[PDB]
Symmetry: C2
Subunit: 266 residues, 2 copies
Amino acid sequence: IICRDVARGYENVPIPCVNGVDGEPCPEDYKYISENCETSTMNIDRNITHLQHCTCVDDCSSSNCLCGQLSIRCWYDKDGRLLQEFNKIEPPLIFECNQACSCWRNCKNRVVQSGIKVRLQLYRTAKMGWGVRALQTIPQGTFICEYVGELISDAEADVREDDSYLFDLDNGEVYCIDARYYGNISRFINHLCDPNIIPVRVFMLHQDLRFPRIAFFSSRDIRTGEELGFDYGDRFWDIKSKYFTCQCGSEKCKHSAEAIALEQSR
Amino acid sequence: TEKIICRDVARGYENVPIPCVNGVDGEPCPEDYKYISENCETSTMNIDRNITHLQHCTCVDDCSSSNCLCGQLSIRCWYDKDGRLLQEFNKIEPPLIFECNQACSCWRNCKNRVVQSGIKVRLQLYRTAKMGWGVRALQTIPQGTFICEYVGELISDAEADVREDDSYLFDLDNGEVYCIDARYYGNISRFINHLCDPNIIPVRVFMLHQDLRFPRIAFFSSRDIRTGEELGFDYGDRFWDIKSKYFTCQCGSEKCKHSAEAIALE
Ligand SMILES: *CCC(=O)Nc1nc(NC2CCN(C(C)C)CC2)c2cc(OC)c(OCCCN3CCCC3)cc2n1
Ligand SMILES: C=CC(=O)Nc1nc(NC2CCN(C(C)C)CC2)c2cc(OC)c(OCCCN3CCCC3)cc2n1
Ligand SMILES: C[S@@+](CC[C@H](N)C(=O)[O-])C[C@H]1O[C@@H](n2cnc3c(N)ncnc32)[C@H](O)[C@@H]1O
Ligand SMILES: C[S@@+](CC[C@H](N)C(=O)[O-])C[C@H]1O[C@@H](n2cnc3c(N)ncnc32)[C@H](O)[C@@H]1O
Ligand SMILES: [Zn+2]
Ligand SMILES: [Zn+2]
Ligand SMILES: [Zn+2]
Ligand SMILES: [Zn+2]
Ligand SMILES: [Zn+2]
Ligand SMILES: [Zn+2]
Ligand SMILES: [Zn+2]
Ligand SMILES: [Zn+2]
């Protein structure tokens, strides 16, 4: 219980920091930001007239909502949680309602843009450094947080010393997000071979497809105190395996030293 | 008699609802515009959003000390303990206000973040006797209270020349000159009328960026405002030299400088 809010009041709820494992102080070699930033011109298309929008006069719960149609359908239920029909392995693009829509700010297609609602905690793990865990039970499909950081080109990523906080934004031109120097609570979520949250690309106040915003949703019910983690992917582990191995301790672990040694012996 | 025609013309985008009533005639709620709570662009403005270009404070307090760089850029911080402008504030020639930003080390609740926190007072869009639609107070507003931001579409000075309707223009006189046009896109401030005895004053504020070409316009009450009193500021003589040949001022004040009487009498 060393810092009551690492977000300095920038989020909807505080995010405290605790360490009950070692003597490492709550980390401060970064700059907490709640929204994405840029350190050089990104030229995001912010033209309000280029936004696809809906004409709904209800709460956008009908199948006629265009923004829902943009995302095949609206995948948020009445409580703002992803339907279990959601393709959790290959998620679609989610187009939330925006400032050009005729609907109200409280419509059913505005989950990610409303911010963090669940209670999270920055805590010291036993073998992974810092991690994030739930201070409450989280039902499946609930929005957790956004991967927030410094928008950079992939040419700039090629000269970055530390690539441990990078999120690729595939789409022509390639961009990505770096949470090394600027980032939010998501920069502390570790890899898990049995993940409980998944990343989804979402569009809100703009629709420039080069800059999708990364939202994390729970892939299953999560108990209190349970660590949150998503699948970092093979690109991360083909690179970092030579310096360290995965410590998630799951019987399904693909990137442990024992797992790597088992299949590279065939 | 007076009918309530809209519960909230902002449709839930502001901190508080802004209702629309009419007890004068049968004009329905205005809908020849798109309500937006924040400024928009229809053509690229190329605002400098580089986070490293942000002058910021290293304050570990609530930014009330004389060492806050952000307050120093406005000579001093002009907000009192409650977020109201000091009475010594230059109401004739307001200085540029630099509120604390995302690069500052302070918390989101520091004393230098009044305008970026949104509308707090209760306003109402109503039908005036002779001035079309207006905005009035539903409470008492002490002197120096932040009222609302003049929100609209950011355009160049050349674009304003080719605009059919120049009744909703606010000029940002910097270097390169730009304007806020609330004709097609605007918020509650687009309904504030001119008063020869004004009770609010515009102040130019910088928040998440510090591009001097694009200051944000904040209305603060220039003195105590009684409940039911209409809100208004001095449009300036550029507006009136253009409009006085098409219509006259109906503020009905003992001090009117733009009525057909006052104009002809000199
Ligand atoms: C933006 C385009 C892109 O894919 N960038 C990128 N690069 C790397 N690897 C290196 C390559 C060269 N390095 C030096 C020689 C300069 C710099 C970067 C990269 C590596 C990753 O894993 C180590 C990585 O990851 C993917 C996501 C993992 N999680 C996501 C959230 C946090 C980490 C991404 C990488 N991207
Ligand atoms: C430097 C760029 C720039 O600001 N330009 C510009 N242009 C105008 N009209 C042109 C339109 C046509 N054109 C010819 C070439 C036809 C020449 C005149 C303006 C008119 C204004 O009121 C009439 C005005 O009032 C501002 C205050 C008024 N209230 C309204 C609510 C808020 C403030 C400002 C105007 N500013
Ligand atoms: C995005 S950061 C996550 C936060 C990080 N653990 C910290 O303390 O700052 C990713 C880094 O955390 C560590 N990490 C994440 N997942 C891991 C895992 N499953 N096993 C071992 N280390 C992991 C690795 O060092 C990796 O470089
Ligand atoms: C920014 S709009 C204000 C809202 C306007 N009353 C409406 O109904 O939409 C400015 C226009 O309102 C009218 N107006 C504003 N102040 C006025 C005044 N003091 N006397 C007469 N008309 C005024 C003028 O027609 C002017 O072009
Ligand atoms: Zn809709
Ligand atoms: Zn909607
Ligand atoms: Zn919509
Ligand atoms: Zn593992
Ligand atoms: Zn400060
Ligand atoms: Zn501050
Ligand atoms: Zn500051
Ligand atoms: Zn007058």
